[PDB]
Amino acid sequence: AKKILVTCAMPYANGSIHLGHMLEHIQADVWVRYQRMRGHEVNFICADDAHGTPIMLKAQQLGITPEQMIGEMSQEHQTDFAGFNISYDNYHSTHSEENRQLSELIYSRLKENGFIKNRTISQLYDPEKGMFLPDRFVKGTCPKCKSPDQYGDNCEVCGATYSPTELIEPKSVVSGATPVMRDSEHFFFDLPSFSEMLQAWTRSGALQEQVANKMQEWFESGLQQWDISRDAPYFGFEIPNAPGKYFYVWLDAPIGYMGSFKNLCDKRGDSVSFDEYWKKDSTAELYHFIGKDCVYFHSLFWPAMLEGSNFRKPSNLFVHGYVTVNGAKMSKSRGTFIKASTWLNHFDADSLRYYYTAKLSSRIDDIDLNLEDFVQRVNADIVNKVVNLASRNAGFINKRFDGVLASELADPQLYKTFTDAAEVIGEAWESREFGKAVREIMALADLANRYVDEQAPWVVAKQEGRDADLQAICSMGINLFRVLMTYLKPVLPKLTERAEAFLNTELTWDGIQQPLLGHKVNPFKALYNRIDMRQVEALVEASK
Numbered sequence: 001a002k003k004i005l006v007t008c009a010m011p012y013a014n015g016s017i018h019l020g021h022m023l024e025h026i027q028a029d030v031w032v033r034y035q036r037m038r039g040h041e042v043n044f045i046c047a048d049d050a051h052g053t054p055i056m057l058k059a060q061q062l063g064i065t066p067e068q069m070i071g072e073m074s075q076e077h078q079t080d081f082a083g084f085n086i087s088y089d090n091y092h093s094t095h096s097e098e099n100r101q102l103s104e105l106i107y108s109r110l111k112e113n114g115f116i117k118n119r120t121i122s123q124l125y126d127p128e129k130g131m132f133l134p135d136r137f138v139k140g141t142c143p144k145c146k147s148p149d150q151y152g153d154n155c156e157v158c159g160a161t162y163s164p165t166e167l168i169e170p171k172s173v174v175s176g177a178t179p180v181m182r183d184s185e186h187f188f189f190d191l192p193s194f195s196e197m198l199q200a201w202t203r204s205g206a207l208q209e210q211v212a213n214k215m216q217e218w219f220e221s222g223l224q225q226w227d228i229s230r231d232a233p234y235f236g237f238e239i240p241n242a243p244g245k246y247f248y249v250w251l252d253a254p255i256g257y258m259g260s261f262k263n264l265c266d267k268r269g270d271s272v273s274f275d276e277y278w279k280k281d282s283t284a285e286l287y288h289f290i291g292k293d294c295v296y297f298h299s300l301f302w303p304a305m306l307e308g309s310n311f312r313k314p315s316n317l318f319v320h321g322y323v324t325v326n327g328a329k330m331s332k333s334r335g336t337f338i339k340a341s342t343w344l345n346h347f348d349a350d351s352l353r354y355y356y357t358a359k360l361s362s363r364i365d366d367i368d369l370n371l372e373d374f375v376q377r378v379n380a381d382i383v384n385k386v387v388n389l390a391s392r393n394a395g396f397i398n399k400r401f402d403g404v405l406a407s408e409l410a411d412p413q414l415y416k417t418f419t420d421a422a423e424v425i426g427e428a429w430e431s432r433e434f435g436k437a438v439r440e441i442m443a444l445a446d447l448a449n450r451y452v453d454e455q456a457p458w459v460v461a462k463q464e465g466r467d468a469d470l471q472a473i474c475s476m477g478i479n480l481f482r483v484l485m486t487y488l489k490p491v492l493p494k495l496t497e498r499a500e501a502f503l504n505t506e507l508t509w510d511g512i513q514q515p516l517l518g519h520k521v522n523p524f525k526a527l528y529n530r531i532d533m534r535q536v537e538a539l540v541e542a543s544k
């Protein structure tokens with residue numbers, strides 16, 4: 001009965017989707033698919049984060065408009081996410097008319113309410129190109145060790161950190177000109193004005209314990225005002241009444257969550273739902289799935305902006321850790337920096353969805369893709385536990401019983417054990433204790449294969465007059481498979497489609513209470529094949 005708006009963090013428009021993005025979007029998608037299975041109204045929303053100086057400069061280097069460039073990357077991203085069956089209700093852009101109007105509205109409300117401050121700052125400026133330089137577009141000689149060709153605020157030889165104004169003989173990365181210090185008036189959002197509100201939210205108990213603990217560090221350091229403006233030239237939204245000024249991307253980017261939802265409503269011809277979800281009196285739930293590096297922005301700056309502009313705030317933040325491969329940060333030289341597009345040339349989407357789901361929890365711990373373990377676990381759990389219940393039993397049913405399952409359950413007590421687990425498994429999906437859910441499902445799968453082993457259908461099948469026993473055993477196994485595939489339906493969308501085709505039925509959460517009796521199933525060829533380390537080695541080689 002709930003109305004839920006769920007988001008993922010927005011991929012940056014100038015980089016391909018990699019396995020780190022996929023952890024976040026798979027985690028959210030599993031949760032979203034479970035919520036849909038329980039009958040709720042869910043809106044799963046994302047977008048490309050498409051503004052800013054790096055995007056402007058990259059387009060210039062490519063010789064195309066930024067609009068053309070971001071359109072091409074948005075299509076690439078959406079192709080990759082479609083390949084992993086991420087079931088968005090809408091995927092939009094921060095570069096949209098909906099986000100322009102909402103960004104202008106929110107800024108005007110913040111300004112009218114006293115939360116925008118004007119301050120003159122000094123920043124390095126490229127006088128040949130004619131633009132202010134972000135830190136990483138300044139290079140020069142390290143003031144400490146004198147190593148040349150160092151970028152931004154740190155030296156990769158001696159490890160020193162410093163202001164780029166301390167670089168010796170600085171050069172613009174854009175033009176090679178010597179940058180100079182130049183003043184500019186900037187507009188600042190007065191985040192400190194919201195400190196008491198944000199502190200109350202932190203101790204409310206909604207957020208993850210590890211997130212709340214980190215927020216206390218940030219309050220202890222002290223909240224600062226945040227610069228929300230940038231000078232022309234820029235790729236973004238111009239600030240009303242401030243010629244030559246633009247909104248900085250991190251003002252307009254989360255407003256893109258709202259813009260993407262407004263776009264969805266407008267395309268549907270739905271004139272009520274936007275206010276029902278975003279007005280202060282909303283009874284709908286709003287959840288953001290994010291990574292560790294987005295927490296400050298989503299837990300402090302974003303709720304403050306919404307409060308200051310008379311909109312509702314997030315119901316919760318769901319934070320995950322970073323992805324590692326073979327225990328370490330992804331490494332280009334080792335071939336463990338793996339693109340989502342590359343993954344799908346070697347493996348299916350379900351394999352990675354399963355593996356991530358089996359490792360995920362409600363905490364913010366990093367998630368390790370160990371590639372040797374990936375092969376072992378997919379084969380052990382998917383092929384040999386779950387799919388085995390269908391593959392070892394379906395042939396007898398199709399060949400000796402015309403595809404018809406028995407008229408009664410052979411072991412009603414065992415079946416009840418399986419359906420009784422629905423409450424704990426569903427609660428584990430609901431609470432994002434994904435590893436717990438998978439452990440419970442696989443424990444059931446072990447019981448199911450123990451039942452079939454005990455009944456020994458490969459023996460019964462050869463013994464005169466035991467046709468009825470064989471049909472009973474094999475039908476029981478298939479009904480246990482039906483239940484397990486229901487519990488795994490949020491996890492494995494394509495395997496589930498193949499299972500529903502075999503079973504001649506849609507899998508619903510409540511449907512497990514009625515087993516398939518006197519029921520025709522269809523033949524299938526391999527529901528799920530084994531993988532091997534040769535394929536892993538090819539993936540790694542292709543990623544170098």
Ligand SMILES: CSCC[C@H](N)CC(=O)O
Pocket residue numbers: 008009010011012049253254294
């Ligand atoms: C509103 S969520 C925005 C997330 C950023 N695009 C993450 C990044 O670019 O590193």
Ligand SMILES: [Zn+2]
Pocket residue numbers: 142143144145146147155156157158159160
């Ligand atoms: Zn140095």
